Protein backbone atom coordinates (compact mmCIF):
# COMPACT_ATOMS: atom_id res chain seq x y z
CA UNK A 1 0.00 0.00 0.00
CA UNK A 2 1.57 3.24 -1.24
CA UNK A 3 -0.92 5.13 0.94
CA UNK A 4 0.98 4.10 4.08
CA UNK A 5 4.15 5.64 2.64
CA UNK A 6 2.44 8.96 1.87
CA UNK A 7 0.67 9.09 5.24
CA UNK A 8 3.92 8.33 7.06
CA UNK A 9 5.67 11.22 5.30
CA UNK A 10 2.66 13.44 6.01
CA UNK A 11 2.78 12.67 9.75
CA UNK A 12 6.44 13.68 10.08
CA UNK A 13 6.26 16.64 7.68
CA UNK A 14 5.75 19.09 10.57
CA UNK A 15 7.98 17.18 13.02
CA UNK A 16 11.53 15.86 13.34
CA UNK A 17 12.53 12.22 13.30
CA UNK A 18 14.03 10.61 16.42
CA UNK A 19 17.65 9.65 15.66
CA UNK A 20 17.09 6.06 16.79
CA UNK A 21 14.20 5.78 14.32
CA UNK A 22 15.43 8.12 11.55
CA UNK A 23 16.93 5.18 9.64
CA UNK A 24 13.98 2.78 9.86
CA UNK A 25 11.32 5.43 9.18
CA UNK A 26 13.26 6.71 6.16
CA UNK A 27 13.25 3.27 4.53
CA UNK A 28 9.46 3.27 4.81
CA UNK A 29 9.07 6.84 3.53
CA UNK A 30 11.26 6.11 0.49
CA UNK A 31 9.83 2.70 -0.43
CA UNK A 32 12.95 0.71 0.47
CA UNK A 33 11.28 -1.33 3.24
CA UNK A 34 8.04 -3.28 3.03
CA UNK A 35 5.02 -1.47 4.56
CA UNK A 36 2.50 -4.11 5.68
CA UNK A 37 -0.69 -4.05 7.70
CA UNK A 38 0.81 -5.08 11.04
CA UNK A 39 3.77 -2.71 10.66
CA UNK A 40 1.39 0.19 9.98
CA UNK A 41 -0.71 -0.69 13.03
CA UNK A 42 2.40 -0.90 15.24
CA UNK A 43 3.76 2.40 13.93
CA UNK A 44 0.47 4.14 14.76
CA UNK A 45 0.68 2.78 18.30
CA UNK A 46 4.34 3.76 18.68
CA UNK A 47 3.70 7.43 17.82
CA UNK A 48 0.07 7.76 18.90
CA UNK A 49 -1.37 8.24 15.42
CA UNK A 50 -5.15 7.84 15.16
CA UNK A 51 -6.06 4.22 14.48
CA UNK A 52 -6.02 3.49 10.78
CA UNK A 53 -4.37 6.82 9.92
CA UNK A 54 -1.78 5.21 7.63
CA UNK A 55 -4.48 3.42 5.59
CA UNK A 56 -6.79 6.44 5.19
CA UNK A 57 -7.09 7.47 1.54
CA UNK A 58 -6.84 11.06 0.33
CA UNK A 59 -9.73 13.00 -1.21
Amino acid at each position, epitope marked *: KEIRRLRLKEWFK*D*K*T*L*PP*K*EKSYLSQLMSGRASFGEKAARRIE*Q*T*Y*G*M*P*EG*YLDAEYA
Partner: nanobody
Amino acid sequence: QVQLVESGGGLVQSGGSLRLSCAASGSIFRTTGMNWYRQTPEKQREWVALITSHGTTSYAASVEGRFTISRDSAGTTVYLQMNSLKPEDAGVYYCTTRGYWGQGTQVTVSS
Protein backbone atom coordinates in the same frame (compact mmCIF):
# COMPACT_ATOMS: atom_id res chain seq x y z
CA GLN B 1 -12.45 7.48 23.86
CA VAL B 2 -9.48 9.16 25.55
CA GLN B 3 -9.47 12.19 27.84
CA LEU B 4 -6.33 14.31 28.38
CA VAL B 5 -5.45 16.89 31.06
CA GLU B 6 -2.52 19.30 30.57
CA SER B 7 -1.31 21.25 33.60
CA GLY B 8 1.72 23.17 34.81
CA GLY B 9 1.52 26.30 32.68
CA GLY B 10 1.73 29.78 34.09
CA LEU B 11 3.56 33.09 33.98
CA VAL B 12 7.34 32.93 34.18
CA GLN B 13 10.19 35.33 33.44
CA SER B 14 12.25 34.96 30.28
CA GLY B 15 15.14 32.62 30.94
CA GLY B 16 12.96 30.80 33.47
CA SER B 17 11.71 27.26 33.82
CA LEU B 18 8.38 25.43 33.69
CA ARG B 19 7.41 21.75 33.72
CA LEU B 20 4.15 20.85 32.01
CA SER B 21 2.30 17.59 32.69
CA CYS B 22 -0.21 15.58 30.66
CA ALA B 23 -2.43 12.90 32.22
CA ALA B 24 -4.29 10.51 29.91
CA SER B 25 -7.07 8.06 30.58
CA GLY B 26 -6.65 4.30 30.90
CA SER B 27 -2.85 4.30 31.33
CA ILE B 28 -2.63 4.81 27.57
CA PHE B 29 0.74 6.59 27.71
CA ARG B 30 2.40 3.40 28.97
CA THR B 31 1.95 1.68 25.58
CA THR B 32 1.29 4.61 23.23
CA GLY B 33 3.19 7.60 21.92
CA MET B 34 1.97 11.19 22.14
CA ASN B 35 2.74 14.69 20.91
CA TRP B 36 2.93 18.20 22.36
CA TYR B 37 1.73 21.14 20.26
CA ARG B 38 1.51 24.82 21.04
CA GLN B 39 -0.75 27.52 19.65
CA THR B 40 0.95 30.92 19.56
CA PRO B 41 -0.06 34.37 18.32
CA GLU B 42 2.00 33.71 15.16
CA LYS B 43 0.14 30.80 13.54
CA GLN B 44 -1.61 28.03 15.49
CA ARG B 45 -0.67 24.39 16.15
CA GLU B 46 3.13 24.33 16.01
CA TRP B 47 4.59 20.93 16.87
CA VAL B 48 6.87 20.94 19.92
CA ALA B 49 7.97 17.44 20.90
CA LEU B 50 7.07 13.76 20.74
CA ILE B 51 7.76 10.77 22.92
CA THR B 52 7.12 7.28 21.58
CA SER B 53 5.62 4.25 23.31
CA HIS B 54 9.17 3.14 24.14
CA GLY B 55 10.47 6.48 25.42
CA THR B 56 12.37 7.74 22.36
CA THR B 57 12.09 11.48 21.83
CA SER B 58 12.20 14.16 19.16
CA TYR B 59 12.07 17.96 19.45
CA ALA B 60 11.36 20.93 17.22
CA ALA B 61 14.50 22.77 16.11
CA SER B 62 13.75 25.88 18.17
CA VAL B 63 13.41 24.03 21.52
CA GLU B 64 16.18 21.43 21.15
CA GLY B 65 18.45 21.53 24.20
CA ARG B 66 16.03 23.67 26.23
CA PHE B 67 13.09 21.24 26.42
CA THR B 68 13.01 17.68 27.74
CA ILE B 69 10.07 15.30 27.29
CA SER B 70 9.80 12.25 29.53
CA ARG B 71 7.45 9.92 31.40
CA ASP B 72 7.10 9.49 35.13
CA SER B 73 8.25 6.25 36.77
CA ALA B 74 4.81 4.68 36.21
CA GLY B 75 4.90 5.45 32.48
CA THR B 76 1.41 7.02 32.52
CA THR B 77 2.12 10.74 32.87
CA VAL B 78 4.20 12.72 30.40
CA TYR B 79 6.30 15.76 31.32
CA LEU B 80 7.59 18.62 29.21
CA GLN B 81 10.46 20.28 31.07
CA MET B 82 10.88 23.72 29.52
CA ASN B 83 14.12 25.51 30.47
CA SER B 84 15.64 28.83 29.37
CA LEU B 85 12.21 30.07 28.30
CA LYS B 86 11.99 32.70 25.56
CA PRO B 87 9.21 35.13 24.54
CA GLU B 88 8.69 33.02 21.39
CA ASP B 89 7.72 30.09 23.66
CA ALA B 90 4.50 31.67 24.97
CA GLY B 91 1.22 30.08 23.94
CA VAL B 92 -1.32 27.42 24.80
CA TYR B 93 0.26 23.98 25.00
CA TYR B 94 -1.78 20.92 24.02
CA CYS B 95 -1.05 17.26 24.52
CA THR B 96 -2.49 14.79 22.03
CA THR B 97 -2.62 11.07 21.34
CA ARG B 98 -4.68 8.89 18.99
CA GLY B 99 -6.39 12.01 17.55
CA TYR B 100 -7.62 13.13 21.01
CA TRP B 101 -6.56 16.54 22.42
CA GLY B 102 -6.63 18.10 25.86
CA GLN B 103 -8.07 21.53 26.55
CA GLY B 104 -4.53 22.93 26.80
CA THR B 105 -2.55 24.94 29.35
CA GLN B 106 -1.42 28.58 28.99
CA VAL B 107 2.26 29.64 29.07
CA THR B 108 3.08 33.35 29.30
CA VAL B 109 6.66 34.68 29.36
CA SER B 110 7.30 38.18 30.69
CA SER B 111 10.42 40.32 30.38
